[model samples]
Target: KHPWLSAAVRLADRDGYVLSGRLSTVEHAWVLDHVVLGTVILPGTAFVELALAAADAVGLPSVSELTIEAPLALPARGAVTLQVTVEALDATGRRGFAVHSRPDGAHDAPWTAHARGVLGAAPAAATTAWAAGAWPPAGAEPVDVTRWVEALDAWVGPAFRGVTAAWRVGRSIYADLALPEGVSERAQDFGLHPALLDAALQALLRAELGAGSSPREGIPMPFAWSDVALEARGAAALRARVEVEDASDGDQLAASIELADAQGQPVARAGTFRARWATAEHVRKAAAG
Candidate 1:
């Protein structure tokens, strides 16, 4: 039981806010953090699902059993599409609200996200994706699940010690993490909101290193990005493709992600992904359980 995964936010006396007990990643900081790079829980399919669940648990009347659909095109990295249906109890009309609260003593960035609106709880058709395997590697052959997990534990998990060094190596790693049931690939594509792009990246890093921080040497340079575009046409049941190219050296690593529909059509494509350096302590902290 991930005790710390639960979230509880109270703003006004009217609407009660309680994130569903089963939240993807279930970390408040990860979801609430409003950074430019963005997080898994901040914005995307994952965030909507969790937010709906939160509203349901707290008895918000206006909205129930709601769902926010993604584009017809699938996501490049994938997605997580969650749904909620609230049985209207009273005359309040399925209304729900999400408030943004900035942490005190932090940077004065006022770009926090807040949404509060009345909605209908007419449970719509929701979707979920499958586990990942048989991705594009040197061999292009399927790797053992245990071995894949081990690799993620090694290289991907640790590279943070020298934020610069780890971030350098991190550029070449392509993460396409399809979380367990209740998680959608669409959610992941929203700039790593619910699980954050890092979660999937960690899996690849583990495959590279071995359950530790990325080494400070031989790592590539940081990533930079201008915009990110996601396709989700046929992502409901398809192989979301994440690719990394031009992995020449520490200078830079060209990366791109795509989501293909069942017919192998390109549903979504991502353009920019910039990376920067980090401190050893930050790496340790990122790797901390």
Candidate 2:
């Protein structure tokens, strides 16, 4: 069964497809673990996972770019219906994709578009030398992630606590992440499990907070993504190297991630990842509706 997608159907009379699914605390309990400022907002990586699934439905293997336009907060009760639509292929052989949702059973409610992007063929494999190098790199300093992980207990639950180890060198943070047993069992269902992928960002977040220069007022949420490609599937453990750019005005941060399997073989790469601080009020508003 497709965890995040229930069904995918090609659009009649058109070169496109639409996939639909349902999400709720009862069915997708893992989502509740992704809390932001006390609000259970769906992790942005889930959107990327959905996009990847959508791409698969249309014969594409990469997400060229995806921008999250709005936050999808899971309410304390009830479920939401999610839809992923893929437009006809463009002249360049790329297809456009979008994710939308609304309160389940609120058929009359207008669907809210959450993310949109392009999908295309996978890019050529990049060299894996960086990941295959010495563990955590020669100059990287070990990061005592124990305290940071403990602090995350306030914002995330067990499923999201996947950063097992981390090290830092200047602006780059390297982390060892793995899915909890229950989540890893279903890894094959997704192109790259969202929880595992979400964990890869934890190191970068911790690094920023540890610097003492970033704002601690709001929760960071992925805002825009680009050039995301997954090379291996069914990976439960990963080594990630994230290169973080200087924060933009204390609210926004950008970075790129290189991912590899436990053996240091390339697993995925995200050319660009941008996150924006989500204020408590903003999260509450999204959660309310």
Candidate 3:
């Protein structure tokens, strides 16, 4: 049950289907749970869920890739209504999907498109065994996960506080994640819950910042994501590792991630996750304009 999405319906056009929802601070107070650089914003993972829901509506079960085009910033007073539309199969049999949001109660304002991606039949799930010999690896050093949680709390909101233990093993970041008690049930439906996956990103963020060599001087927002895949379903607790593989075109950083269940069974994987620093200047500019 999403606090924001009020309904999902099939389109009469037979092209595909449309899922309708609205996000209001008055209706979904929990939307505030996702804070970024002191601004209340929709989490990137929420867009992923919208795409997945649209996929479900049209009988597609997997999202091979989704790209975040713009940040869906929530206003302090007014609400935002969203529509996720998944179209019928194309020549290649892949379906097209897109997400759009507009300020609630605004008079004829244009809807802003946030994310777009393709959906297809889910691949057979498989348990990926990364040849690593043991849990946490051998040479990695434990990180002060407690402090990281606190930082995440003050910055990204308490809902993102899922990281239990973490380690810095050279260029990669690894952590254990758990959904808070009542919300853990989401595992029943999602291959990997958005909150949990978002926490995985948080773990990666902490890992990147704490690496002691990052050149960016501001908060990290997922500027672009690619090659995302969900292999297995139903996981309440998970393990995640992120590695900053390379930087390109000056400021873009690329990372690869592998997510697994508590028992170390693979659940999801993403290749070519890229990010850019939304420095304080960027935040202020958005606020001003």
Candidate 4:
């Protein structure tokens, strides 16, 4: 059985697959660290991991694009059963996938769709070594993330606290992130552990601070991802550079992230990541039954 998936079975008459599992804050306790507006929600990266696991079962190597349609909030006391389904490959050899979940024992309950995307061959690996020569790059202005991280401590727990330092260069943000000890030990179990990847994006919140918006305004959550590829696996520590741009949605930001190991080799890259501000009211409403 896979860590995130309990069982995977190939379709008998079609080139597709189905993978299922149960998720709970009790068992996957790390999820409790990902809180938004007092609600414990599953990280978008976990959906990416679920899709990647499903794709792996059918021989797909990368996620072409994924759009998180809804947030999957874990109840304070119960678990949810998750199902990931991969459709028959299209002419281009890419498989379409969807992730759905419902209360663990509610077999008759409607499954809520949380995310959907396409999976296929790996894209060209990233060649640009993030912050190539020197570690922080010579002239980049250092941004003190101490207070920023402290602010996050109100909502994001220690298990998900990965951003240790950050620097600013124009509209780009460079951050140093690492998986917490307990999470680091299981890094090998995922294509890219959710907490580590989630932390890599934490620097974007620092950018928010620069904008003068209060962290209490809302927690940013990934809305869409495209051209994501994992060049190397089990990266416990990474130097990441995120190129930020204004999205058409005035309140949202679009970014491109490139990650490299300590020695500066490419580890992962996301061509585009779009985040939506989940306001306190919005999150409370979404998580409420």
Best by TM-score: 2
**Candidate 3 lDDT:** 0.71
Query: Candidate 3 clashing pairs?
Result: none
Off by over 4 Å in 2: 149-151, 211-215, 247-250
Error of 2 at 163 (Å): 0.3
RMSD of each: 13.9, 2.1, 3.4, 2.2
Task: Give the Å shift of residue 123 in candidate 1.
Answer: 35
- Quantify all predictions' global Cα lDDT against the true fold: 0.33, 0.83, 0.71, 0.81
Q: Please provide, for model 1 over 1-289, each residue's C-alpha lDDT reduced to its tens digit, 9 standing for 90 to 100.
A: 1222244555355434433222222233233232211111233334333343444454432122222221111122332222222223346445444433232234363423333333433332212121133334233433223433321223332211111111122333323334333334344333223343334333333434444445543322122321233333213333333345645555444454333444545443334333333343433333231
Candidate 3, residues 1-289, lDDT tens digits: the string is 4445668887786877777878776644444677777766777887876776666567776675788877777776668889887878998768888899988877488878888888876654534454245768778888766653333556765566778888868778878888766667556755456778787788777666664544556776776665566656667788888877756555666787778875667777776577676875676555343
Residue ranges of candidate 4 with Cα displaced over 4 Å: 149-151, 211-216
Query: If scored against the real structure, what TM-score would every candidate get?
Result: 0.37, 0.92, 0.82, 0.91
The backbone clash count of each candidate, in order, is: 76, 0, 0, 0
* Comparing 2 and 3 on TM-score, the stronger one: 2
Model 4: worst 10 consecutive residues (lDDT sum) = 207-216
Candidate 2 has a TM-score of 0.92
